[PDB]
Amino acid sequence: MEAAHSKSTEECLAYFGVSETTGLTPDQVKRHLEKYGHNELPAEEGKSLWELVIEQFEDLLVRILLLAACISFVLAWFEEGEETITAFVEPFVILLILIANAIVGVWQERNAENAIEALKEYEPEMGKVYRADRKSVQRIKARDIVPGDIVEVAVGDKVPADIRILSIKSTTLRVDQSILTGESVSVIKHTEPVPDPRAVNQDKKNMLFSGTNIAAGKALGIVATTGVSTEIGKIRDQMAATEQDKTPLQQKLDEFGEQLSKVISLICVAVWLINIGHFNDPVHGGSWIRGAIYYFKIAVALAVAAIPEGLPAVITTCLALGTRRMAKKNAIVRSLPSVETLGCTSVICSDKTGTLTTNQMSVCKMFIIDKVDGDFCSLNEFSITGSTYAPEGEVLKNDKPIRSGQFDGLVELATICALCNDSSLDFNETKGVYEKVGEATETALTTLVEKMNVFNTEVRNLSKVERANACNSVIRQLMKKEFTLEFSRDRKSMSVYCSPAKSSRAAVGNKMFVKGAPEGVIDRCNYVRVGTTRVPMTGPVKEKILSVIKEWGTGRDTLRCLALATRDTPPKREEMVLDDSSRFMEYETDLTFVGVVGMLDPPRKEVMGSIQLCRDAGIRVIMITGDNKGTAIAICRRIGIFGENEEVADRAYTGREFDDLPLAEQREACRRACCFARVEPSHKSKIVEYLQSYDEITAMTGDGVNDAPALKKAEIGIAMGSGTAVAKTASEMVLADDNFSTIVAAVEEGRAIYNNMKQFIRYLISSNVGEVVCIFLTAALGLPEALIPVQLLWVNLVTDGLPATALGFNPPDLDIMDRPPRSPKEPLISGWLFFRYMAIGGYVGAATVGAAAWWFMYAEDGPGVTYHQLTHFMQCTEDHPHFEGLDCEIFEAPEPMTMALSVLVTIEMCNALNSLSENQSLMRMPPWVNIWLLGSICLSMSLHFLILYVDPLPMIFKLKALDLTQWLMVLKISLPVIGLDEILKFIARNYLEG
Report whether 203 belongs to an annotated binding site: no
Stretch that binds ligand ADP, among 80-88, 89-97, 509-517, 965-973 (CB under 6 A): 509-517
Min CB(730)–K ion separation in Å: 7
| Residue 353 in the binding site for ligand ALF (CB under 6 A) | yes
Identify what 353 binds: Ca ion, Mg ion, K ion, none; CB under 5 to 8 Å per kind: Mg ion
Q: If we measure between CA atoms, which residue out of 39, 281, 284, 335 comes closest to residue 158?
A: 39
- Of the candidate residues 156, 257, 438, 704, the single one contacting ligand ALF (CB under 6 A): 704
**φ and ψ at residue 156, rounded to 5 degrees:** 100, -35
Q: If we measure between CA atoms, which residue out of 155, 845, 933, 229 comes closest to residue 484?
A: 155
Min CB(604)–ligand ALF separation in Å: 13
| Residue 489 in the binding site for ligand ADP (CB under 6 A) | yes
- Of the candidate residues 36, 296, 367, 487, the single one contacting ligand ADP (CB under 6 A): 487
For residue 432, how many other CB atoms are within 10 A of its CB?
8
Min CB(450)–ligand ALF separation in Å: 25
Closest residue (Cβ) to K ion? 717
595-625 core/surface letters (b: 16 or more CB in 10 A; e: else): bbbbbbbbbbebbbebbebbeebebbbbbbb
Instruction: Indicate the pairing of strand 162-168 with strand 174-176.
Output: unpaired
Stretch that binds Ca ion, among 12-20, 159-167, 797-805, 806-814 (CB under 5 A): 797-805
Q: Angle at the Cα of 616 (from 629 to 641), degrees rounded to 5?
A: 10
| Residue 353 in the binding site for Mg ion (CB under 5 A) | yes
| Residue 625 in the binding site for ligand ADP (CB under 6 A) | yes
Percent helix, strand, coil in the chain, to 5, is: 45, 15, 35
Choice between 355 and 805, CB closer to ligand ALF: 355
Report the alpha-carbon distance of residue 184 to residue 192 in Å, rounded.
Answer: 24
CA torsion, ordered 932, 935, 939, 940, to nearest 10 deg: 70
Report the alpha-carbon distance of residue 691 to residue 383 in Å, rounded.
Answer: 42
Report the alpha-carbon distance of residue 20 to residue 22 in Å, rounded.
Answer: 6
Stretch that binds Ca ion, among 115-123, 642-650, 780-788, 789-797 (CB under 5 A): 789-797
**527 with 592: CB under 8 angstroms?**
yes
Report whether 309 belongs to an annotated binding site: yes
Choice between 415 and 701, CB closer to K ion: 701
Task: Sort 110 into a burial class: Cβ within 10 Å, 0-12 / 13-18 / 19+.
Answer: middle
Min CB(626)–ligand ALF separation in Å: 4
Report whether 332 belongs to an annotated binding site: no
Report the alpha-carbon distance of residue 805 to residue 763 in Å, rounded.
Answer: 10
Q: Which of residues 683-722 bind Mg ion (CB under 5 A)?
A: 703-704
Report the alpha-carbon distance of residue 750 to residue 734 in Å, rounded.
Answer: 16
Q: Which of residues 679-708 bind ligand ADP (CB under 6 A)?
A: 704, 706
Q: If we measure between CA atoms, which residue out of 319, 431, 459, 413 comes closest to residue 754?
A: 319
**643 with 674: CB under 8 angstroms?**
no
Min CB(57)–Ca ion separation in Å: 15
Min CB(818)–K ion separation in Å: 27
Query: Residue 524 to residues 513, 562, 912: CA-CA distances in angstroms?
Result: 13, 14, 72
Stretch that binds K ion, among 74-82, 175-183, 423-431, 706-714 (CB under 5 A): 706-714
Report whether 627 belongs to an annotated binding site: yes
Query: Residue 804 to residues 105, 810, 911, 933: CA-CA distances in angstroms?
Result: 13, 10, 11, 8
- What residue type is 716 in one-letter code? I
Instruction: Indicate the pairing of strand 620-624 with strand 675-677.
Output: parallel
**385 with 393: CB under 8 angstroms?**
yes
User: Where would I find the beta strands (DSSP E) of 715-792?
Assistant: 716-720, 733-735
Stretch that binds Mg ion, among 174-182, 351-359, 399-407, 673-681 (CB under 5 A): 351-359
| Residue 515 in the binding site for ligand ADP (CB under 6 A) | yes
Within 123-227, residue ranges assigned H as helices are 178-181
Q: Which of residues 620-659 bind ligand ALF (CB under 6 A)?
A: 625-627
Report the alpha-carbon distance of residue 618 to residue 616 in Å, rounded.
Answer: 5
Stretch that binds Ca ion, among 173-181, 213-221, 384-392, 759-767 (CB under 5 A): 759-767
Min CB(627)–ligand ALF separation in Å: 5
* Per-residue contact flags (x/-) with K ion for residues 714 to 743, judged by CB under 5 A: x--x--------------------------
Min CB(641)–ligand ALF separation in Å: 13
Q: Examine the residue annotation and report whether 426 is marked as an active-site residue of this protein.
A: no
Q: Which residues contact 216 (CB under 8 A, 6 or more apart)?
A: 155, 170, 172, 173, 174, 186, 486, 705
- Of the candidate residues 225, 447, 472, 706, the single one contacting ligand ALF (CB under 6 A): 706
Choice between 223 and 792, CB closer to Ca ion: 792
- Of the candidate residues 68, 366, 419, 517, the single one contacting ligand ADP (CB under 6 A): 517
Q: If we measure between CA atoms, which residue out of 759, 767, 849 comes closest to residue 808?
A: 759
Q: Give me the catalytic one of 351, 422, 737, 981.
A: 351
Q: Which of residues 79-118 bind K ion (CB under 5 A)?
A: none
Identify what 604 binds: ligand ADP, ligand ALF, K ion, none; CB under 5 to 8 Å per kind: none
Give strand pairing partners of 167: 220
Min CB(625)–ligand ALF separation in Å: 3
Closest residue (Cβ) to ligand ADP? 626
* Per-residue contact flags (x/-) with ligand ALF for residues 14 to 43, judged by CB under 6 A: ------------------------------
Identify what 341 binds: Mg ion, Ca ion, ligand ADP, none; CB under 5 to 8 Å per kind: none
Choice between 218 and 352, CB closer to ligand ALF: 352
| Residue 749 in the binding site for ligand ADP (CB under 6 A) | no
For residue 50, how many other CB atoms are within 10 A of its CB?
9
Stretch that binds ligand ALF, among 271-279, 348-356, 661-669, 753-761 (CB under 6 A): 348-356
- Of the candidate residues 226, 230, 247, 353, the single one contacting ligand ADP (CB under 6 A): 353
Q: Which of residues 268-307 bind Ca ion (CB under 5 A)?
A: 307
Choice between 442 and 748, CB closer to Mg ion: 442
Q: How many chain residues bind ligand ALF (CB under 6 A)?
A: 10
For helices 311-328 and 741-781, the axis angle rounded to 10 degrees is 160
| Residue 493 in the binding site for ligand ADP (CB under 6 A) | yes
- What residue type is 76 in one-letter code? A
Identify what 717 binds: K ion, ligand ADP, ligand ALF, none; CB under 5 to 8 Å per kind: K ion
SS3 347: strand
Binding residues for Mg(2+): 351, 353, 703
Binding residues for Ca(2+): 304-305, 307, 309, 768, 771, 796, 799-800, 908
| Residues annotated catalytic, as ranges | 351
Q: Which residues bind ligand ALF (CB under 6 A)?
A: 351-355, 625-627, 704, 706
